[PDB]
Design a protein around this ligand. Structure first.
Ligand SMILES: [Ca+2]
Ligand SMILES: [Ca+2]
Lengths: 266, 714
């Protein structure tokens, strides 16, 4: 964000497209008011249609965009918008992208999970530490998300404090290092995770076992998990819950009727 | 030369019997895991550090190096370790005061407050949840492990989830607790403060008896799950009226008053005034009024001081009716005498606290969590005096556990670490005093009070404790059938054998007959005399309890058609002296099939077709309104109007499938010419009634819910 004469000149970073999250289209535009709202309803020939009151700021030769200060319009009314090759779009107010000073950088934290968008753990917490060690203080957030910090140039380290351990498992390193500098001024660090899914497994013997029988499960490897006899249906042993595919062994530290019920989606 | 000791709880829980034997927590350690302390308070002190477990900051540093713990620090001889586990930039000071407060100075009331274990040292882990509870689980586990490592003797855990299961909790937490047990560490946890299914609406209906809500992890086998009784005494700012200093049935004219949501609150120690207008409407007033007219909480014209409509209820209800512009109120025996003396007289509100007898004294706390585990086990384990109910009972049992663990370490020196913590729990439960509900004059259900109110003396004096088949201070039978039998085992820890006579009191739930709802009071069906057994010194003996409940199956099944609880206590006394060696063990079973109770509430359509109604369903508007926002089991679909002069661009949102908008604009469950509603959908794409999805009122925890469609021929 710089000025020439009376400037107001926003030049977006280069969108390094080449891909499926590569950017095909970008626009700067401001949202004019009319009748009180930032949209209007035009009665077309076929029926009714609705649209934001966009007015586009042309891309100058210089690569920049000229934010002429004008009217009753403000920097919280200007938007920079991007559409990637798969057709997701993202917008931001030019005020929020301007809120990061020129001497500062942006780091962004997130979970890489192999599932779609809405079936994702959206909640977790982290801690950011110095070149020396101390936690980061006076947190400045970026574009209205709590996982994008604005920090001065330097070397830093971030730690995954907490997340939903009853919903997923950490698959990558818990403390990752990142460095913000004048050219590398936007880093994204992610913690890859794998989704956890659970089953209710139950071994239902046809006849009562002899007292103190030990009923157990044999995992993928030679591991064994102990099952506890239910208090309400004494024939029904299958107690435990962890999920993945098993076979049943009864020690005394001989039927079957084995049932696992896919149970999940909290 | 020291001020006297406040014994409001000590006299009831019988701590003196433990102190007078040498058990004050010397060289023991309680780890409070909670939201915040102040290690500098007048009460964070110990007498004689030479006997403490941790004798110096250097000792503490040593342990931290040994255990591999590079954070937190020793603070004083009392708080020997403290740390923040939520480190990224008081409530639990009371709990610490209660376990281990040892003050030389006196408090506001003139007396000095001593915790249960005044000579214990303390460790403080700041841990709590912020957005999605369960994310905090990892910090809690780090806390438990550090308490264990740096050498705690008891852990007071502040953590709850509502309707916990005993055998099927959260794997890493339950395991870290198991390691804590294997290190000899009692783990004490509040039961919870949600009380029963539907506590914010009405009492549970008699067809739905799985109403328990005890919370995880107190529902684990290992932790001690503490329910809460209301203290007999309160310490708070009273309100005086001097023309009444003579009528002692009114604490000598000092009232307990309350308020709700802070309208324009009090202006202390100034002889204000008011007279009595009990005609609630338009009297010649010159501005105390009886809220006898239960109409609406609207305070009077300018000067309030309302009083109770129900003689002796002494609820002093929160929410001031029976915005601002005055102040709150609400007591009664002071009202119907304050209204004497000519019509009116002068009062003032005190600025220094006083002791005064409690209005809810000796009654189970309304919010203390109740009922079984989600998967059928008997919790909570025990009661102590205490939305911060159970949370203030919990440290009482943590301190008691310190004292009893001391007893065990002296008189059973070779009892192994892997087996002491359970003995501490079992002695506490077996020696508790069974409560009686002073209102209904009948025994409180073990689903509410556990093995009874704490009794520290009994636990460190009798050598007895009691046990069931599963080797635990209480008995979870399971399904019951017309004939209940179980085997009780008594253990003796003294070196002189004792002889005990034992009977069996049997209880079920009391049910309100005109409303078809439990009353959350118990009903004593019968006491079954059971004989006599002699417990060998340093041994055990087993007797069998057998009961025939056949006589009751008609009436109980009729008032509770899906099964009822049969529960109660096996009570042992000394054979020659009725008051020695009082021990007992609670049991509960279910006459029916608990594991099969209905999971979802009946469908709203079926219910309407029997003239019945749901448990949360508002019968508000027109006849057979089922507004999608109400609470019912039914199907929901999405509607959109057919517009003849435009393309529609707007859906109408969800509505109850089977209901249709009427003249006034309300969705009514319309009936076809045969009399019935009609569930039907049209997947044409028009986005009008194109799908059907399930909406439930769930009576029980569930899993594996899914929807399927079959042909009706099938
Ligand atoms: Ca205990
Ligand atoms: Ca349709």
């Amino acid at each position: 964000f710089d000025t020439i004469n009376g400037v107001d000149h926003f030049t977006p970073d280069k969108t390094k497209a080449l891909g499926s999250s590569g950017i095909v289209r970008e626009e700067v535009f401001y949202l004019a008011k009319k009748n009180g709202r930032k949209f209007d309803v035009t009665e077309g020939k076929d029926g009714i249609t609705v649209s934001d009151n966009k007015v586009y700021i042309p891309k100058n030769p210089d690569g920049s965009y000229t934010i002429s200060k004008r009217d009753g319009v403000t920097l919280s009314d200007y938007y920079y918008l991007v559409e990637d090759r798969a057709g997701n779009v993202s917008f931001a107010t030019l005020r929020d992208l301007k809120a990061v000073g020129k001497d500062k950088a942006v780091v962004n934290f997130g979970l890489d999970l192999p599932v779609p968008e809405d079936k994702q753990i959206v909640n977790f917490t982290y801690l950011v530490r110095d070149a020396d060690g101390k936690p980061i203080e006076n947190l400045e957030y970026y574009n209205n998300s709590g996982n994008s910090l604005i920090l001065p140039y330097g070397k830093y380290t971030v730690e995954l404090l907490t997340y939903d351990t009853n919903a997923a498992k950490l698959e990558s390193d818990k403390i990752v290092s990142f460095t913000l500098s004048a050219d590398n001024n936007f880093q994204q660090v992610t913690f890859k995770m794998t989704m956890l899914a659970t089953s209710q497994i139950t071994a239902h013997f046809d006849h009562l076992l002899p007292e103190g029988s030990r009923v157990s499960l044999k995992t993928a490897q030679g591991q064994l998990i102990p099952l506890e006899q239910s208090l309400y249906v004494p024939k029904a042993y299958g107690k435990t819950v962890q999920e993945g595919t098993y076979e049943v062994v009864v020690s005394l530290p001989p039927n079957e009727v084995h049932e696992l019920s896919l149970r999940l989606v909290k | 030369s020291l001020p006297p000791v406040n014994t409001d709880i000590h006299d009831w829980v019988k701590t003196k019997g433990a102190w007078d034997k040498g058990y004050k927590g010397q060289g023991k350690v309680v780890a409070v895991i909670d939201t915040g302390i102040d290690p500098a308070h007048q009460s964070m002190r110990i007498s004689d550090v030479s006997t403490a477990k941790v004798k110096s900051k250097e000792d503490m540093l040593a342990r931290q190096k040994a255990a591999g713990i590079n954070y937190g620090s020793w603070i004083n001889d009392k708080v020997v370790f403290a740390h923040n586990y939520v480190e990224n930039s008081s409530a639990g000071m009371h709990v610490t005061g209660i376990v281990a407060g040892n003050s030389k100075e006196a408090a506001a009331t003139g007396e000095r407050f001593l915790g249960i274990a005044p000579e214990a040292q303390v460790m403080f882990m700041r841990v709590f949840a912020n957005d999605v509870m369960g994310s905090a689980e990892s910090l809690f586990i780090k806390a438990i492990e550090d308490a264990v490592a740096l050498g705690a003797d008891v852990i007071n855990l502040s953590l709850g989830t509502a309707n916990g299961a005993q055998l099927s909790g959260s794997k890493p937490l339950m395991e870290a607790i198991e390691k804590a047990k294997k290190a000899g560490v009692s783990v004490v946890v509040a039961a919870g403060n949600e009380r029963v299914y539907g506590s914010d609406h009405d009492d549970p209906l008699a067809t739905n008896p799985d109403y328990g809500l005890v919370g995880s992890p107190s529902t684990g086998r290992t932790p001690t799950s503490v329910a809460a009784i209301n203290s007999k005494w309160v310490i708070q700012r009273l309100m005086t009226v001097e023309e009444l200093e003579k009528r002692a049935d009114l604490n000598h004219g000092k009232a307990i008053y309350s308020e709700s949501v802070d309208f324009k609150n009090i202006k202390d120690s100034l002889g204000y005034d008011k007279s009595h207008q009990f005609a609630y409407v338009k009297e010649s007033t010159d501005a105390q009024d009886v809220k006898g007219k239960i109409a609406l909480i609207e305070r009077d014209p300018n000067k309030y001081d309302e009083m109770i409509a129900l003689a002796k209820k002494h609820g002093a209800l929160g929410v001031l009716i029976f915005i601002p512009s005055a102040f709150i109120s609400h007591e009664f025996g002071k009202a119907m005498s304050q209204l004497n003396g000519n019509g009116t007289g002068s009062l003032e509100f005190d600025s220094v606290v006083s002791k005064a007898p409690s209005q809810k004294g000796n009654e189970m706390n309304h919010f203390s969590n109740w009922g079984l585990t989600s998967d059928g086990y008997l919790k909570p384990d025990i009661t102590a005096p205490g939305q911060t109910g159970t949370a203030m009972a919990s440290p009482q049992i943590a301190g008691a556990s310190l004292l009893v663990k001391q007893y065990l370490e002296k008189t059973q020196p070779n009892l192994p670490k892997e087996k002491i913590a359970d003995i501490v729990k079992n002695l506490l439960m077996s020696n508790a005093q069974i409560h009686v509900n002073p209102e209904t004059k009948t025994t409180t259900s073990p689903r509410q009070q556990g093995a009874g109110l704490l009794n520290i003396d009994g636990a460190v004096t009798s050598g007895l404790y009691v046990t069931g088949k599963d080797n635990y201070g209480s008995i979870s039978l399971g399904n019951i059938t017309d004939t209940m039998t179980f085997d009780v085992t008594v253990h003796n820890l003294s070196n002189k054998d004792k002889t005990l006579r034992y009977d069996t009191e049997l209880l079920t739930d009391h049910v309100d007959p005109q409303k078809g709802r439990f009353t959350l009071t118990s009903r004593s069906l019968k006491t079954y005399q059971g004989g006599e057994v002699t417990v060998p010194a340093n041994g055990k003996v087993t007797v069998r309890v057998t009961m025939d409940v056949s006589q009751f199956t008609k009436e109980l099944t009729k008032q509770m058609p899906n099964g009822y609880y049969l529960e109660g206590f096996v009570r042992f006394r000394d054979s020659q002296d009725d008051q020695l060696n009082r021990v007992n063990i609670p049991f509960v079973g279910f006459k029916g099939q608990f594991e099969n109770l209905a999971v979802a509430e009946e469908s709203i359509y079926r219910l309407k077709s029997q003239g019945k109604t749901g448990f949360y369903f508002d019968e508000s508007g027109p006849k057979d309104d089922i507004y999608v926002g109400k609470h019912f089991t039914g199907l929901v679909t999405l509607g959109s109007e057919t517009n003849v002069s435009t393309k529609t661009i707007s859906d109408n949102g969800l509505h109850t499938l089977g209901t249709f908008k009427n003249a006034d604009g309300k969705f009514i469950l319309e009936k076809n010419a045969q009399g019935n509603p009609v569930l039907a959908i049209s997947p044409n794409g028009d986005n009008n009634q194109d799908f059907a999805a399930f909406k439930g009122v769930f009576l029980r925890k569930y899993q594996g819910l899914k929807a399927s469609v079959y042909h009706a021929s099938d």
